[PDB]
């Protein structure tokens, strides 16, 4: 049970054990400090000789040295296993985030991913760290305090050892009540904070109707309600301490009375009584922290289960076995039908799109609907609903994704640039396999060395963020430069640029004239040149292959591309 | 200066001063407890069994009652003033953004206004109140303890009063070190969080190149770095205390030795040294918290200036003087040019629109460019850049907004509904002028009693956010109910219903029939009917009135309308 999770922390036994054994001391220091008080009072100012207490100052400075030193020692080596656990859990969580299907990045939680890796992991680490310090420092304080109370008294210690757990029960009962009261106040805050948002949501609708005069009053009401809720918060919050300490003080009064009611007691010297009172007026930090520590175990465990839920989500499917070497073939679609998880109306009806070997097919679309997602099935980002995307006679579901996505080179306007060497980005994820003599020729072949040698370090330049901010039109030039070195047989130019670089975009077009001498390419088109030389044009109108032919056999057939050729003429 | 900071809490002497008088008592009781601890040692346990042992058991509970009650009173009646200053400051702060020019809601800060007001106000007075009660009850403690310490010894506390500045300066310098060290970590966190966020943005572009492994490598080297920075945080922070603790301990040792070097001692009654020691160690909670109250004055003034940066920003221009009783005039544009504050490409080039009274104009440009914002100029949201939007023979800038924005009626589907009764929405900002007798038949004439009766009460259903959620098409019907009740002279449809709804459309096109019987109306038309029945159709091809004229004379003149009629044939 509890024993089962120790092997998870086994490599950190040194750090955690040093933490424990340098934590006990920080408590033992205070215990022995009060022990030092008894001679000072009983003999230092009880007896005449002044040398009786000259022993004190050295030993008190020494015990405070040994308390500060172990404070620092046990804070650090509990903030090093706090770190080498949050780190490994974050790293094991991000290594199971780069393997989730692209649908998981549907913008429902794009910003949260840094938080999931950080805020929740920081929460679990900090909660567990704080919980472990306060069930051991406080726990052995209490053991030490009661050991030194026994050695100096009998009856007072026995009376205290019974009536204190009543203070403990009081501490928890005053707390549980506070938590129960505070439970619904989050709902109250949500309800009150909704309304201010609504009113500043429609500021236009306030001006356009002359109604400032009847919005000042509404926010007057909402601000009054918010203030009264805050006052209720404060009033309910500040009956915790002034009540538990009242219970504790009544217990201390019982201690004093029932420790001096008969003549059986008062055998205590002037020192033992001060030591008993000292230990107890001290014991309030442990008896409360050790009692409220359970506010962290369940909270830390809640955070840990949150992390284990976000970890146990859906892995991107991998139900394929085949491995492809270099697939030159007539990739095809057949009766494909596909709807994004989370939507109702399908984007694609029965499709018979057919990329031939060598030839290239161009997609054109008036409303921009249904084109782009034909590039997210031919690479298996989204598994198709009903159909079979043939590729040399097999469904794409049966190829190992790492060997299928190894066939498709996706040039684009909006390609990503890792903040690394240009020599990396042109051979990204394969720098071991490819030498700089290949990049030397390739970055020329895509006409991009002219944009690189101008920089400070050439191909050593940091090219991403915190880097040299490569221009968007030249990120497409780099996308070509990269897809040349891979020299993959299926190409997916997105050509969604629309942006124009004079002569530079001309050099980009010349590069593409080198990129697609081969490499069956599904280019989604918005430019005259690509369609002009296109080998089989396939136009979709918002759901389905509407018209499909070749430019010279199309423009006479008035169809739908010709009446779109006019619109981008 | 501080003398003139008095009137801002003018009506709040009562609660604040009562808090102060019940807050000095909270320190005086702490002092009295140790004062009573003095006799309990020597006289109480020396040669007696009562008269101390009988006083103390009930007087201790008396003083802890007087301590708890004063803590409750202080906290509650300082929180009353805290909340009643938060409410008034936040009320003024909100009332100074209902008069803010609509540029302010350009999505730069639309969602952050609620967070701004609530967090800034909840921080400005929490810090000030904490500082106030941390400079009184942490400041009365020192005076009370020193009084009770001089009364019990004439010289043993002279060394403490001489020594205390050493402790104060040590605490302040250590805290200042820690704060100075904590400066660059904002930059470090920015540097690492930027890398982490940049790292998993391009998920598509990592899958497609088969580079998962060389990606987990980079993340493990980022997590290593960020954990190292975390350990630096903790190692820097955790040694703030254990050094000032050593300093105060050196103070205690110096005092303890000094109490025994010369013959000056032996005037210490057996319990006098006990209360002197206790009063000294109890003096660590004040003396340490008193130095670090400037750390809260600084935060309070920082937040005050932070809100003052906003409570006095730019204010929607009002520089007009004329008034309107009814805008029965022909709105005239002339050579108007306009580019959004914060944008470079001109949204509107030269214009010559001449909307005549009693007729309509249909803004129908396919580019969806420029028509949406010839409705934010005629109503004076975003003012023109060059030109004059003449209205009824006068300019807009010659007219006070109070009635200018009362003329136009901005019908649409996106009309935000206030969280009030439906028959409050219909006459919003005018509930006194319109009696529900009018509102009933007004819902009738705009076709609304039909979907209103089916509601639970009648024209009475709270309808806004967290209300009933009227249908998108019924929101248009209720927007007509408003605009028809007001009886405006200039109407601005917006036809945001590109996706038409049947049946609702019958009653919508029927309602809009009554609204546009007279009442000159700039209609952003998109539906065949409004364009067909318009009087001067006007297109805007992304910058300029391109093709203007009546329909049947415009279909014959191809230009850009016929080519745009075919697309929506």
């Amino acid at each position, epitope marked *: 049970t509890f024993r089962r999770l120790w092997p998870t922390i086994a490599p950190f036994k040194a750090g955690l054990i040093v933490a424990g054994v340098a934590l006990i001391l920080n408590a033992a220091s205070d215990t022995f400090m009060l022990s030092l008080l008894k001679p000072l009072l009983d003999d230092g100012f009880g007896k005449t000789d002044r040398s009786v207490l000259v022993w004190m100052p050295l030993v008190v400075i020494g015990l405070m040295i040994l308390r500060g030193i172990t404070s620092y020692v046990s804070s650090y080596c509990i903030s090093w296993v706090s770190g080498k656990v949050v780190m490994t859990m974050r790293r094991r969580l991000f290594g199971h985030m780069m393997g989730m299907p692209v649908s998981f990045f549907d913008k429902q939680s794009t910003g949260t991913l840094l938080s999931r890796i950080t805020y929740d992991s920081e929460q679990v680490a900090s909660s567990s760290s704080g919980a472990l310090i306060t069930v051991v420092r406080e726990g052995a304080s209490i053991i030490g305090l009661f050991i030194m109370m026994f050695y100096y008294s009998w009856q007072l210690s026995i009376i205290l050892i019974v009536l204190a757990p009543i203070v403990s029960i009081a501490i928890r009962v005053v707390s549980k009540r506070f938590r129960n009261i505070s439970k619904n106040m989050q709902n109250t805050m949500g309800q009150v904070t909704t309304s201010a948002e609504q009113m500043l949501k429609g500021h236009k609708e306030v001006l356009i109707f002359g109604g400032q005069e009847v919005e000042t009053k509404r926010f007057d009401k909402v601000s009054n309600r918010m203030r009264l809720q805050g006052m209720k918060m404060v009033s309910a919050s500040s009956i915790s301490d002034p009540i538990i300490q009242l219970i504790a003080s009544l217990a201390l009064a019982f201690v004093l009375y029932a420790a001096s009611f008969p003549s059986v007691m008062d055998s205590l010297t002037a020192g033992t009584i001060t030591v008993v009172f000292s230990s107890m007026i001290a014991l309030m930090r442990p008896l409360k922290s050790l009692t409220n520590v359970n506010a962290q175990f369940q909270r830390g465990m809640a955070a840990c289960q949150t992390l284990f839920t976000i970890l146990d989500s859906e892995q991107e499917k991998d139900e394929g076995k085949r491995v492809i070497e270099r697939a030159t073939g007539d990739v095809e679609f057949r009766n494909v039908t596909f709807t994004y998880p989370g939507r109702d109306v399908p984007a694609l009806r029965n499709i018979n799109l057919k990329i031939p070997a060598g030839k290239t097919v161009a997609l054109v679309g008036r409303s921009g609907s249904g084109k782009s997602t034909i590039a997210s099935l031919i690479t298996r980002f989204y598994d198709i609903d009903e159909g079979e995307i043939l590729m040399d006679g097999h469904d794409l579901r049966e190829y190992t994704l790492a060997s299928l996505r190894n066939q498709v080179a996706l040039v684009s306007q909006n390609v990503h640039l890792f903040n690394d060497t240009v020599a990396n980005n042109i051979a990204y994820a394969r720098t071991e396999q490819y030498s700089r003599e290949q990049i030397e020729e390739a970055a020329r072949m895509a006409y991009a060395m002219d944009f690189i040698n101008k920089m400070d370090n050439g191909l050593d330049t940091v090219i991403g963020e915190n880097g040299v901010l490569l221009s968007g039109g030249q990120r497409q030039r780099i996308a070509i430069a990269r897809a040349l070195l891979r020299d993959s047989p299926i190409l997916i130019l997105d050509e969604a640029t629309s942006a124009l670089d004079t002569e530079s975009e001309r050099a980009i077009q010349a590069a593409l004239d080198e990129l697609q001498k081969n490499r069956t390419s599904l280019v989604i088109a918005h430019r005259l040149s690509t369609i002009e030389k296109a080998d089989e044009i396939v136009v979709v109108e*918002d759901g389905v292959i*509407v018209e499909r*032919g070749t430019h010279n056999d199309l423009l006479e057939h008035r169809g739908v591309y010709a009446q779109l050729h006019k619109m981008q003429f | 200066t501080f003398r003139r900071l008095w009137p801002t809490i003018a009506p709040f002497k009562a609660g604040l001063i009562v808090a102060g008088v019940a807050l000095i008592l909270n320190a005086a009781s702490d002092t009295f407890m140790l004062s009573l601890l003095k006799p309990l040692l020597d006289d109480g346990f020396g040669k007696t069994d009562r008269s101390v042992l009988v006083w103390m058991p009930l007087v201790v509970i008396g003083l802890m009652i007087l301590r708890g009650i004063t803590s409750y009173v202080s906290s509650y009646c300082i929180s009353w003033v805290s909340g009643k200053v938060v409410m008034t400051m936040r009320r003024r702060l909100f009332g100074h953004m209902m008069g803010m020019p609509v540029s302010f809601f350009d999505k730069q800060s639309t969602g952050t206004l609620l967070s701004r007001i609530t967090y800034d106000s909840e921080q400005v007075a929490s810090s000030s109140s904490g500082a106030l009660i941390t400079v009184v009850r942490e400041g009365a403690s020192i005076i009370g303890l020193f009084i009770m310490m001089f009364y019990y010894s004439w010289q043993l506390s002279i060394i403490l009063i001489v020594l205390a500045p050493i402790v104060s300066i040590a605490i302040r310098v250590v805290s200042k070190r820690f704060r100075n060290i904590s400066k660059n970590m904002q930059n470090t966190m920015g540097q690492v969080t930027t890398s982490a966020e940049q790292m998993l943005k391009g998920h598509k572009e990592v899958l497609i190149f088969g580079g998962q492994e060389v990606e987990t490598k980079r993340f493990d080297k980022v997590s290593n770095r960020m954990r190292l920075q975390g350990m630096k945080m903790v190692s820097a922070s955790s040694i703030s205390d254990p050094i000032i603790q050593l300093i105060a301990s050196l103070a205690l040792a110096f005092v303890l030795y000094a109490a025994s070097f010369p013959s000056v001692m032996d005037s210490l009654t057996a319990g006098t040294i006990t209360v002197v020691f206790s009063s000294m160690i109890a003096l660590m909670r004040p003396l340490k918290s008193l130095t670090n109250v400037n750390a809260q004055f600084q935060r309070g003034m920082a937040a005050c200036q932070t809100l003052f940066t906003i409570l006095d920003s730019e204010q929607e221009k009002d520089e007009g003087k004329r008034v309107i009783e009814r805008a029965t005039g022909d709105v005239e544009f002339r050579n108007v040019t306009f580019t959004y504050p914060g944008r470079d490409v001109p949204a509107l080039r030269n214009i010559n629109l001449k909307i005549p009274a009693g007729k309509t104009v249909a803004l129908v440009g396919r580019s969806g460019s420029g028509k949406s914002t010839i409705a934010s100029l005629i109503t004076r949201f975003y003012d023109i850049d060059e030109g004059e939007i003449l209205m009824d023979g006068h300019d807009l800038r010659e007219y006070t907004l109070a009635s200018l924005r009362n003329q136009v009626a901005l019908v649409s589907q996106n009309v935000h509904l206030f969280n009030d009764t439906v028959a409050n929405n219909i006459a919003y900002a005018r509930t006194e002028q319109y009696s529900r007798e009018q509102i009933e038949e007004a819902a009738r004439m705009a076709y609304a009693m039909d979907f209103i009766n089916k509601m639970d009460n009648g024209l009475d259903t709270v309808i806004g956010e967290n209300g009933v959620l009227l249908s998108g098409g019924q929101r248009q019907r209720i927007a007509i109910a408003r605009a028809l009740l007001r009886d405006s002279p200039i109407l601005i449809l917006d036809e945001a219903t590109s996706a038409l709804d049947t049946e609702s459309e019958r009653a919508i096109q029927a309602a809009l029939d009554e609204l546009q019987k007279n009442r000159t109306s700039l209609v952003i038309a998109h539906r065949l009917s409004t364009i067909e029945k318009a009087d001067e159709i006007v297109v805007v091809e992304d910058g300029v009135i391109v093709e203007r004229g009546t329909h049947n004379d415009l279909l014959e003149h191809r230009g850009v309308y016929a080519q745009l009629h075919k697309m929506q044939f």
Partner: nanobody
Amino acid sequence: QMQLVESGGGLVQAGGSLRLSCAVSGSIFSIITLAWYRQAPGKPRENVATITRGSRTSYCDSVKGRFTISKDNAKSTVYLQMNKLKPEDTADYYCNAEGPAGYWGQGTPVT
């Protein structure tokens, strides 16, 4: 894999009118571009008429103002009506769906 079947006439007197029909079964009939092409015994194929998703009709030139085309919303069938026939119109007519590089019907020669 869809299929589209043509129904038409034979030999009629010149200057009259006729109606050809093509039923297209096996796909989404509403959106797909339907069309009618013709081919002479010697000359190759060529376009005659076209009809689109919003029924935006379009025609050749030598028969402009003389021909008509439409399609039933659910019947899934396209009608091409011919008026003022000429002797030069004796040719083999075909119907077509999804552009000029897709599916074709059997068609029929008309004199």
